[PDB]
């Protein structure tokens, strides 16, 4: 498996809607390109995917869903770890069929 060091987490947009309504960006440094097993360590946020493709450019993006105004959780990529916090805004749609 590829090695990951200096992993930092940022949030582009959050919105606590029913669907996957937040986009997260991870910046890292790797020795080789490959596959990693991303996870979230809190039930505050649920990820979309379980596997990610790491490339030497060093940036990946993920989608998550939550329902709190101020989420805060630890995301792990391969063997690394980082802390994410964000601010979220209410959705405008009243009723959805999913």
């Amino acid at each position: 498996a590829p090695t990951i060091i200096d992993l930092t987490c940022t949030v582009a947009t959050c919105t606590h809607s029913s669907d996957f309504g937040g986009v997260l960006t991870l910046t890292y440094k790797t020795d080789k390109n490959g596959d990693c097993s991303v996870h979230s360590h809190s039930n505050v946020a649920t990820l979309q995917e379980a596997t990610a493709k790491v490339k030497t450019a060093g940036k990946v993006t993920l989608h998550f869903s939550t329902a709190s105004a101020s989420p805060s959780f630890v995301v792990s990529l391969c063997s690394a770890r980082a802390t994410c916090s964000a601010s979220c805004e209410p959705p405008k749609d009243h009723i959805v069929p999913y």
Partner: protein, 49 residues
């Protein structure tokens, strides 16, 4: 998705509107007032020659 705004009544002014729905990427509209016409209402009184 309802929306409301105010735009000036000046011909050729390139008004732009911003609409931001939380579940989607924001959208921008370009509006322009190519022409106006203020027509009154008339009641003929008489005619002279």
């Amino acid at each position: 998705y309802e929306h409301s705004t105010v735009m000036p009544n000046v011909v050729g002014f390139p008004y732009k509107a911003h609409i931001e729905r939380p579940g989607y990427s924001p959208l921008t509209l370009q509006m322009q007032v190519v022409e106006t016409s203020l027509e009154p209402t008339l009641n003929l009184e008489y005619i002279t020659c």
